[PDB]
A paper describes a structure:
The tRNA m1G37 methyltransferase (TrmD) is considered essential in various bacteria, including Staphylococcus aureus, a pathogen responsible for a wide range of diseases. TrmD was identified as a potentially selective antimicrobial drug target, due to its essential role as well as the structural differences from Trm5. We have identified selective S. aureus TrmD inhibitors with inhibitory activity in the nanomolar to low micromolar range using a direct-to-biology assay read-out. To analyze the binding mode of the compounds identified in the nanoSAR study and to guide future inhibitor optimization, we cocrystallized S. aureus TrmD with inhibitor 2 and the new TrmD inhibitor 8h.
Hill et al. discovered the thienopyrimidone inhibitor 1 by screening a collection of fragments against H. influenzae TrmD, and their subsequent optimization resulted in inhibitor 2 with activities in the nanomolar to micromolar range. The cocrystal structure of 2 was solved at a resolution of 2.5 Å in the space group P4332, containing one protein molecule per asymmetric unit. The N- and C-terminal domains of the monomer were resolved, but the highly flexible linker connecting the domains could not be resolved, similar to many published TrmD structures. ,− For the cocrystallized complex, the N-terminal domain showed discrete electron density for inhibitor 2. Also, the conformation and ligand interactions of 2 were found to be similar for both H. influenzae and S. aureus enzymes. An ionic interaction was formed between the primary amine of 2 and Glu132 in S. aureus (Glu116 in H. influenzae), a residue highly conserved among TrmD orthologues. The thienopyrimidone ring system displayed interactions with S. aureus Met149 (H. influenzae Ile133), Tyr152 (Tyr136), Leu154 (Leu138), and Pro105 (Pro89), within the conserved SAM pocket. To analyze the differences in binding affinity of parent compound 2 between the H. influenzae and S. aureus enzymes, we used the HYDE scoring function in the SeeSAR toolkit to predict favorable and unfavorable contributions of individual ligand atoms to the overall binding energy. The computer-aided investigation revealed that the main difference stems from the amide group interactions, which contributed favorably to H. influenzae TrmD (HYDE: −3.8 kJ/mol), but unfavorably to the S. aureus enzyme (HYDE: +11.0 kJ/mol). Additionally, the terminal amine of inhibitor 2 contributed favorably (HYDE: −3.0 kJ/mol) for the H. influenzae enzyme, whereas it resulted in a slightly unfavorable interaction for the S. aureus enzyme (HYDE: +0.3 kJ/mol). Also, these two crystallographic findings rationalize the results gleaned from the nanoSAR optimization: the transformation of amide to triazole and the transformation of benzylamine to guanidine were beneficial for S. aureus TrmD affinity due to their protein–ligand interactions.
Numbering used by the authors: 19 to 175, 188 to 261
Write the structure that this text describes.
């Protein structure tokens, strides 16, 4: 598996690529990563990478020329996945992280442009993906974030409830005391207490999850005595 980033700000990938999980995984001969710059493939390098839109338009538009040239020498194939970071792409998701982790070659087209030449989309891009309804400056951070979720899912690199509260040393800290049950060594009571907390927190902060949860008699009894202790 190999992952390529087509970007104008390749320096912006410095920390991410050289540090943490991707830095380790690259070294294990698990994936090859390349950071390629658009401007390098500009036909003229003076009116390059982008230009005015035919028929008028709000902003500048990424030109097809540099992009097809980049794909050409990146050895892109019909099995490759050419992902375009765009605001109106499909929101990224876990099922997509799996599908892409199962792919050999991935090419991210990262950009800030008000628009992308349609010929790029119709004949190169296999996938268009966003991070969500909000507005970002460009595609690099989304490309890196998607890479993170995909890479950890490459080999070799919920119960329907919110999680239970967790605590560690010290036991007492600014008057804030770890629940005693967690120090008692009674694993049945520790699990039961954790389960009660899961139920109560989900009740308070995600009641929709309680509705989708197969509540036992004990679970109902727990919620009632909680909503009665409240008064
Ligand atoms: N006015 C149109 C317009 C066009 C491009 C941009 C630059 N944005 C991106 O390249 C982007 C990539 S993935 C993603 N996910 C969520 N939001 C985003 O903005 C993005 C912003 C606004």
């Amino acid at each position: 598996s190999k992952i390529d980033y087509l970007t104008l700000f390749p320096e912006m990938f410095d920390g991410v690529l050289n540090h943490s999980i991707m830095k380790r995984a690259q070294e294990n001969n698990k994936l090859q990563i390349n950071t390629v710059n658009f401007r390098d493939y500009a036909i003229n390098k003076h009116n390059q990478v982008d230009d005015y839109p035919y028929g008028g338009g709000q902003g500048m538009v990424l030109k097809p020329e540099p992009v097809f040239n980049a794909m050409e020498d990146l050895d892109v194939t019909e099995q490759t996945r050419v992902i375009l970071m765009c605001p109106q792409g499909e929101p990224f998701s876990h099922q997509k992280a799996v599908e892409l982790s199962k792919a050999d070659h991935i090419v991210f087209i990262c950009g800030h442009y008000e628009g992308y030449d349609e010929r790029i989309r119709t004949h190169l891009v296999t996938d268009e993906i966003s991070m969500g309804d909000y507005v970002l400056t460009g595609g690099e951070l989304p490309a890196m974030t998607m890479t993170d979720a995909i890479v950890r899912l490459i080999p070799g690199v919920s119960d329907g409830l919110l999680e239970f509260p967790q605590y560690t040393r010290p036991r007492e800290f600014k008057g804030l005391t770890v629940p005693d049950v967690l120090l008692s060594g009674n694993h049945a009571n520790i699990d039961a207490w954790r389960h009660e907390q899961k139920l109560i927190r989900t009740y308070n902060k995600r009641p929709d999850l309680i509705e989708k949860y197969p509540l036992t008699n004990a679970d109902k009894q727990i919620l009632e005595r909680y909503k009665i202790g409240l008064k």
